[PDB]
């Protein structure tokens, strides 16, 4: 039948791509960075601790000013923090308590949140009256909202559990672009330094690079063994790191179209929940289910430090735009700032 | 110069904190419940007693219960089921090979590393339907389970005067299938509360209320290292 013909036509195309990638693997990243000096032991300490939330924190996002950050806990609250003074700037009661993601607009005027309600709600923080009201509700996803990221005040890309990513247009509430390549639940997404491309990681152990404007899947990155939970672009925009349930982090290169480095240890058997780079991309911070956050040498694949302050599963972690501090969220209601 | 902002920011922070203490009183007073059931099971019939999740609020003896139905979601639960790791109990509605598929789903919920402290309330909601097919020749419980011919009614069984001894043996065999998974991995962290539902009784919220009271009691006994 033609179904077996399409499977055979796809099976050989998989061999054509696999052999084209092997031809480019002339030297690994561990061989190019063999003579560089190690970064040494990284010892960060908990500078701040945020204790406002009443339940497990699922997501957090820094503002572009590196001072304000928004967190999302499943108690039904969206709290905006002043990391310097530890004060709470806003507390937003959510209609649905099962929030799974939160985002901060680069202009600092709006915040987004989504979860099991299958809605991406936008909250205006700069209203004339002063109070924070829900400005828009984006409906159309047939699965839970996993991640959302503002491109600007009027555009936002969302990943959902319906195996689909969507590019929304605020002020109209309509999907302008739909990304349907993935076969499993998309769990994370990361915008490049420019807002023209973004990567997504789904539960099919695969990562896909998307063009925002054209709505096409340019490249597909495999190599993981289990569900990809986290993803983050390199500061230069030519690579990205993924975190999966196979207890490993992997570095993929866009131009090389293959995996470059694997960050794993035998003493690590828990999944990775969050990944983030430094301002220079030399360090790779990953949150684990063992209540700790390991700091990896992105160029040498050697653990450079441990962030063990949290008492429960580290759900989220984010680095400021100036690389000055690292915020980590946990399934304990507390959020810790590291430096 | 900047003391005007650092004081106005500390005033709004205290206004936020006084509101969060009113939320902490409401959030900790209500008990959250996860309603989990297949398609054939009468899951919506339990609610008697599009949206990505359905919320129903009821009150039993001045105690607030917030039950959540997971609708408009795909059958891949391994990612969003981790959100319900702090609920009081997971309501598991089973229809009495849909029975084997429910035994595997309860096995995955029971042995999940994030749901191993979450108790499970079990409801077999097709007792009236099971009572018609067991005494007839279309029960289909002997071919799907060959160890049923070797099974006898337990001594702890409570046979009602309106059910035949075969349905009593049949419904207690299905209950022993779910209790076999609970006893193999139960180490005092979470428990299973199986109940028989004939879908004609409105006393199911009294069973949830009584089972959630046993869960909170066992959680308090565990904090004092008494149980």
């Amino acid at each position, epitope marked *: 039948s033609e179904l077996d013909q399409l499977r055979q036509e796809a099976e050989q195309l998989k061999n054509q791509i696999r052999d084209a990638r092997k031809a480019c693997a002339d030297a690994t990243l561990s061989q190019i960075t063999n003579n560089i000096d190690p970064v040494g032991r990284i010892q960060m300490r908990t500078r701040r601790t945020l204790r406002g939330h009443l339940a497990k924190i699922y997501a957090m996002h820094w503002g572009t000013d590196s001072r304000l950050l928004v967190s999302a806990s499943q108690d039904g609250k969206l709290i905006i923090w002043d990391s310097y003074t530890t004060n709470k700037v806003h507390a937003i009661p959510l209609r649905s308590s099962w929030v799974m993601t939160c985002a901060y607009a680069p202009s600092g005027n709006y915040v987004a949140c989504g979860g099991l309600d299958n809605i991406c709600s936008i909250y205006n923080l700069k209203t004339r009256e002063g109070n924070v009201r829900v400005s828009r509700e984006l409906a159309g996803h047939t699965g839970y909202l996993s991640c959302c990221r503002f491109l600007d005040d009027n555009q936002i890309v969302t990943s959902s559990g319906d195996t689909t990513c969507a590019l929304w247009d605020i002020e109209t509430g309509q999907q302008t672009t739909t990304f349907t390549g993935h076969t499993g639940d998309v769990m994370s997404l990361s915008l490049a330094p420019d807002t023209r491309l973004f990567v997504s990681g789904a539960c099919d152990a695969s990562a896909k690079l998307w063009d925002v404007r054209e709505g096409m899947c340019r490249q597909t990155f495999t190599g993981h063994e289990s569900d990809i939970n986290a993803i983050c672009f390199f500061p230069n925009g030519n690579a990205f790191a993924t975190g999966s349930d196979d207890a490993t982090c992997r570095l993929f290169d866009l131009r090389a179209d293959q995996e470059l480095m694997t960050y794993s240890h035998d003493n690590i058997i828990c999944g990775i929940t969050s990944v983030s780079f430094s301002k220079s991309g030399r360090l790779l911070l990953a949150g684990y289910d063992d209540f700790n956050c390991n700091v990896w040498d992105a160029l040498k694949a050697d653990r450079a430090g441990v962030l063990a302050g949290h008492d429960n599963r580290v759900s989220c972690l984010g680095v400021t735009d100036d690389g000055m501090a690292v915020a980590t969220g946990s399934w304990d209601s507390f959020l810790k700032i590291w430096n | 110069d900047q003391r005007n902002e650092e004081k106005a920011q500390r005033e709004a922070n205290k206004k936020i904190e006084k509101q969060l203490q009113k939320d902490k009183q409401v959030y900790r007073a209500t008990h959250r419940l996860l309603l989990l059931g297949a398609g054939e099971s009468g899951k919506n019939t339990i609610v008697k007693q599009t949206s990505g999740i359905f919320e129903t609020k009821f009150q039993v003896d001045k105690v607030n219960f917030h039950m959540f139905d997971v609708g408009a979601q795909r059958d891949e639960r*391994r990612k969003w089921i981790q959100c319900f790791n702090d609920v009081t109990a997971i309501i598991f509605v089973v229809a009495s090979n849909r029975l084997q598929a429910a035994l595997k789903l309860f096995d995955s919920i029971w042995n999940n590393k994030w749901l191993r402290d979450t108790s499970v309330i079990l409801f077999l909601n097709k007792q009236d339907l099971l009572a018609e097919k067991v005494l007839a020749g279309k029960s289909k419980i002997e071919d799907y389970f060959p*160890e049923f011919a070797r099974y006898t009614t337990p001594e702890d069984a409570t046979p009602e005067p309106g059910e035949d001894p075969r349905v009593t043996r049949a419904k207690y065999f299905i209950r022993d299938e779910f209790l076999r998974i609970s006893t193999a991995s139960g180490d005092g962290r979470h428990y299973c509360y199986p109940h028989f539902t004939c879908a004609v009784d409105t006393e199911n919220i009294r069973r949830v209320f009584n089972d959630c009271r046993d869960i909170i009691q066992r959680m308090h006994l565990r904090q004092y290292e008494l149980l």
Partner: nanobody
Amino acid sequence: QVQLQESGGGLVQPGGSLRLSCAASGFTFSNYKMNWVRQAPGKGLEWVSDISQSGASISYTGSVKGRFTISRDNAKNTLYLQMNSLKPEDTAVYYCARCPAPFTRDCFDVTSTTYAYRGQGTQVTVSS
């Protein structure tokens, strides 16, 4: 690239025997629990059997208990299913399903309609 290709299968007469093979690649085969699932014509995906990471813990569905035998070879990264005394009710497409996370006792979503980490399946027809 997680890959699962099921070999074997074919047309068997009722009462015969057959051996299904599942070749795995792209992941540490010893760290994962493996499953067998089938889909009868006009029915949904039904769980058949599973086996632990080492091979000690083994479970079957009631219909095939005493007839089917599941075994794994971690050195060869292959899963087996010896199907004895086949009857026409066993006619289905048998899939090799791996549940997603390693070192986990729970084994989720193997019988989902659109589920990754599951092979394309092999046709097993029990006809006269």
